[model samples]
Target: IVGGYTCGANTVPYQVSLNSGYHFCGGSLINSQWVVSAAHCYKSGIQVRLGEDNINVVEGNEQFISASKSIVHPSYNSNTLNNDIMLIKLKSAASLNSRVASISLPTSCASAGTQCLISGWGNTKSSGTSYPDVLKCLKAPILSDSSCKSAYPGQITSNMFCAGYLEGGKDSCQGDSGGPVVCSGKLQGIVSWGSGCAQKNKPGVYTKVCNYVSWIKQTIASN
Candidate 1:
């Protein structure tokens, strides 16, 4: 828990409504005006939440606003869920300074096992439904690369790493697909995937924030 990250400033969880069809996924605020989320979070009728919590019931401070535009990584493939990153430009700047903030991206980390924090409306228990109320948080150590390698085996590619636990049963469950995974006090990963919630022998994999810096920078630069 030494490296477990914090939420509030520089970290905001995103919730999207997709034409009232498929389920929503979590996201993060990487920029003051731009939000980073999973590519698949986009759809014809999608809406984003800035601050507060409770995806199903967004009242009071937890209000839902329409998006100006959404840009999922062009190379993203839904079939493989690769290049799963995406960006959402808000119609207006987030004036709310409270907990809605943008997180800084760290260029590198000296070692793994550093602590990180991940929050969402995702299920508190594995194989359960997503959270329906107030925001929830979880802790995942910056997995040691060797341990990461062994746990994920052949699927542990260079471009990606993981966080959370197998037996702890606390992680990016069903709906936390694209939220931030802050490690060592810096934005390190994006919630991606896992074997299934928190199944044993599996770690919740996330898109390494440092690995895709160029693309992220260019995308935001052009905007």
Candidate 2:
């Protein structure tokens, strides 16, 4: 997370780290037994670590839960990175507490210029490896769809949106994919892709969560 700061303990109780021996992607706890993440981050043998503030050290508040099922959006397009969202059902329900809880889904689509919080343990450098041991967060305003389309030119879709400084100073990075983008306390976006970490005219592109609310609820209810 370039130009971000460490998140205090329990500050982001909904944040979870996806792991397979180590932290690879970030996730959000949406319920006792479900998590929301990027479809691109899906892999077998994943373990979800909740209540985690630092990945390098064991925090007593953390709960390590294995994945029972991973359902990726059927329309997910790796080629263009469209519909880059997924839901993971935990093997066991997470015990909610002060250091671990669920976050509400967006009631409506977020608008341009709305300030949002992006949190994760992705890299801090734009060019090289510099993964933060602790979770980091940045506040960036949502960009208009027109502006986002212009930034990516033919790549931005309705299922995705951009948020960050146009000149580029702060943004999510590698290992941050599947992290949470919270707007008004609701899960608004999922870290999906970007041209490069925190680069000029290349704001962070996220999976638009609003488009999948019904899908999420239906999947949860049917499964």
Candidate 3:
């Protein structure tokens, strides 16, 4: 739960700070006007803050945009945590700048053992109560469906995949829900949920982006 490193300011341009009265969740900017996040993060009064690293103070490149609406996947099942993806439509399009851009969606799912990047302002440790003001980046390996299932049998459904270590010490915690799991410079997954942060052999579960690309596109277009 505590193996991540501090990310350079604005290093991940697509990372978004989703605040609902406070910093509660993270998201990824998929386009100028839309953000992708975990459906579980859906709630009232959420705003998307873009182009910034530090959440405490205003930065030159920061853009605070209000969310016009949100669309949670119709099939989202909270009990099983499957199809845990959502899109937030910004009231106005974000103005692209040096520190603001969008992440590319994946064309295919990631294979086993592929090293991926997960970034967010989630808790430093699962036992810890506080979260970092600056973004944190960590590298985790994608676990095969077989390996993931071995760790969490009967729970790893097709809509979900996983990444992290077998022994523990690196994972996304509570505040990291709805953040990006990037592989090969593409958006591969969204941090959805986990049994417990960084638990042994319990790799962090994520919403497989490739499987929902069609739903994403259709939702974006019809919106």
Candidate 4:
């Protein structure tokens, strides 16, 4: 994440890194066997690394599990980035501990101005390559739908919402897609897209998790 701070080890236990030899995307463990991420990050042979803090370090607390199956939202539109959510079933249930745990999903939608914490291992710079070894986190407040629509006209959809600074500074960047945006202790958003990394009039847009709660539950139940 650009313009953010390194997270303390094990503090954000629900946060996870999607890897195929290296970290590519961020995800959140929603349950022992299910993870939530962005559909755009999907790829075959994905390994979910839980309890991760520093990507470059080999911490014994980490749990490397293969993805058993993945289900992208049927209504997902890559062009418009609508319904960008996805669910991954773990090859096996994760062992919950202080260093690894699951976060609760949001029951109600977060309103505008609700402060949230976004965590990831994305590039710190807007223009260069500077992916941090340690997980980074930024505190951003949710923007109103009207405000978000004004920033990116004809792009914002009901399934999408935005957070971060309008004048530029903090945002989720390239490698941060599918990361968790935890609001009020629940998973509210998934990093989806933006114009650029922390650019003026461009805030980090996320998949509105509230819109897909039913889909997530149904998918998990049937799959």
Residue-pair clashes per candidate: 5, 0, 1, 0
Per-residue lDDT value at 65 in model 1: 58
Alpha-carbon error at 15 in model 3, in Å? 0.3
- Candidate 3 per-residue C-alpha lDDT over 82-149 given as tens digits, one digit per residue, 9 for 90 to 100: 89999999999999876899998899889889999999998888666777888999899899899989
Tens digits of lDDT, candidate 2, 1-223: 9999888877999999999999999999999999999999989999999999888898788899999999999999989999999999999999999889999998999999999999999999988888888889999999999989999999998899999988997999999999999999999999999988889999999999999999999999987
How does each model score on TM-score?
0.82, 0.99, 0.97, 0.98
Residue 172 lDDT, candidate 2, scale 0-100 = 92
Off by over 4 Å in 1: 1-23, 56-59
Model 4: per-residue Cα lDDT at residue 98: 81
Q: Looking at candidate 2, what is the lDDT of residue 6?
A: 86
CA lDDT, every prediction?
0.66, 0.94, 0.90, 0.93
Q: Cα RMSD to native, each candidate?
A: 4.0, 0.7, 1.0, 0.7
- The residue pairs in collision within model 2 are none
Candidate 1 per-residue lDDT, tens place, 1-223, comes to 1112234332343322222343366777666667778786666556667665544454555545566888888888776667878888777776556555667777884257778777765555665553545556677776777777788777666656777674645667766677778766677877787777767767788777786778888988988
Ten residues in sequence with the least summed lDDT for candidate 1: 1-10
